[PDB]
Design a binder for this molecule. Structure first.
Ligand SMILES: CCCCCCCCCCCCCCCC
Ligand SMILES: [Ca+2]
Length: 456
């Protein structure tokens, strides 16, 4: 219509998935869906080579603490041998091409840029790098990231900050400011929650358009079908993953309704398919060079979604092998193993400012406890399996191997591989969501369930 394109840049260990709900909100208010673009990049090399400062000097987080512990000391040397000026130049030239293609497609003369966390550091350096690049930017939005620096010269900038306690608040408390920018605060929100919230959407839309949006809801569209564009990619490093995808419509207990899949395809990174609005589906994937069968579950699509992401574990940060000892035990034919994901921190420790606790039940047992999901761990990914493969559910003994992974935690719960698994969430901001799926065995299968990041 009379709108300009918007481009989003994610933070450390992030992807286009943190702007998926915001893209659907922009389209519900009149934007052509294809006007909302995302730029993805390898965050492990960027942090170590370009943002070494933030990494070991708090500007950022505690990944620095868990780099030598996770990445192979040799691999780390290969990464560190890369030229910094070279990495900066080649990555910025790729963003140039994404911006130029959005301008040619829309006829606009400028675009709006949005960054989250480490992505804010990335964008301030990008806009400051040349007059030519800044001349193509109408507005810059910085979400819960950098502070204590000048907004780029001549570009209207908005900075939005969340609850300091949220993560290592060992620094500035409730007083972070970007110089010469409009600065505002949401003290009731955690880190990733601030990026995906409907209140943040209303603030960004008014800053760039001059009026309040008519709605912040994810409005179902008319028609029987929806267009879905997605990608299978490596966690954190974000490179394209190759494999085979089978899609099956399923009933209320997770049983497949058709004999053959409704869609079957060879995927190399990005894929596109037409599906039924409001219908529950199972996305089965087999990745090249692994015999494991993956089953991904989520709520039905109610409108077109051009930003879906399916995360896959790959070197040099193969987080999934942390679970291999148990997958190799004879007991694995008898239990299931699952990963629960939500781009809005799951919190089991009570706090006033935040004002609420989440409850997450698996076969009736709450795994979002004060011990497993404390505020400081900012849990977006929760692993549930039988630690030790001993047939015992010891929920009070922490699973130490995950204490070193960012945004993740784990629960020692025996889930029998017979019949179905029941999963239910009661959100700290109100409302509930539930799933029933088959209890696939861990010796040959992996289960991923993604909860919606906002329930009205
Ligand atoms: C700021 C964004 C945080 C994102 C947290 C994601 C947690 C889930 C990690 C999934 C790792 C790959 C799993 C592959 C399938 C077993
Ligand atoms: Ca156990």
């Amino acid at each position: 219509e009379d709108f300009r394109p918007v481009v989003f840049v994610h933070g450390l260990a992030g992807s286009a998935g943190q702007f998926e709900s915001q893209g659907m909100r922009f389209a519900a208010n009149g934007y052509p869906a294809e006007y909302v673009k995302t730029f993805e990049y390898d965050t492990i090399s960027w942090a170590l080579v370009v943002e070494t400062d933030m990494l070991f000097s708090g500007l950022g987080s505690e990944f620095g603490l868990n780099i030598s512990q996770i990445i192979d000391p040799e691999t780390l040397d290969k990464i560190l041998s890369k030229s910094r000026e070279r990495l900066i130049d080649e990555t910025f030239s790729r963003l140039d091409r994404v911006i130029d293609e959005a301008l040619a497609e829309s006829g606009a003369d400028k675009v709006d840029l949005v960054g989250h966390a480490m992505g804010t550091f990335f964008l301030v350096r990008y806009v400051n790098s040349s007059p030519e690049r800044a001349a193509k930017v109408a507005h810059l939005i910085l979400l819960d990231g950098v502070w204590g620096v000048d907004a780029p010269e001549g570009i209207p900038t908005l900075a939005v900050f969340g609850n300091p306690k949220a993560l290592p608040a060992l620094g500035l408390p409730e007083e972070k400011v970007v110089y010469n920018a409009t600065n505002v605060y949401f003290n009731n929100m955690t880190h990733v929650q601030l990026c995906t919230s409907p209140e943040t959407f209303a603030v960004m839309f008014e800053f760039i358009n001059g009026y309040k949006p008519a709605t912040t809801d994810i409005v179902p569209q008319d028609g029987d079908y929806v267009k879905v564009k997605g990608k299978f990619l490596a966690f954190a490093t974000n490179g394209d993953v190759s494999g085979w995808l089978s899609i099956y419509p399923i009933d209320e207990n997770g049983k497949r309704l058709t004999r053959l899949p409704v869609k079957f395809m060879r995927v190399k990174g990005d894929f596109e398919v037409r599906l039924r609005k409001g219908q529950l589906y199972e996305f089965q994937f087999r990745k090249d060079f692994s015999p494991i069968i993956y089953h991904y579950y989520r709520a039905p699509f109610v409108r077109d979604d051009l930003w879906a992401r399916f995360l896959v574990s790959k070197p040099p940060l193969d987080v999934e092998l942390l679970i291999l000892p148990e997958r190799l035990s004879p007991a694995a034919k008898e239990t299931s193993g699952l990963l629960l994901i939500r781009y809005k921190e799951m919190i089991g420790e009570y706090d006033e400012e935040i004002g609420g606790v989440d409850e997450v039940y698996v076969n009736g047992v709450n795994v979002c406890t004060e011990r497993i999901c404390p505020i400081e761990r900012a849990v977006n990914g929760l692993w549930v399996f039988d630690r030790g493969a001993d047939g015992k559910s010891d929920l009070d003994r922490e699973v130490v191997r995950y204490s070193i992974m960012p945004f993740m935690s784990a629960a020692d719960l025996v889930v029998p591989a017979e019949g179905t698994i029941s999963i239910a969430v009661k959100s700290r901001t109100g409302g509930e969501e539930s799933f029933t799926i088959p209890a696939w065995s861990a010796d040959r299968h992996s289960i991923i369930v993604q909860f919606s990041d906002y329930i009205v």
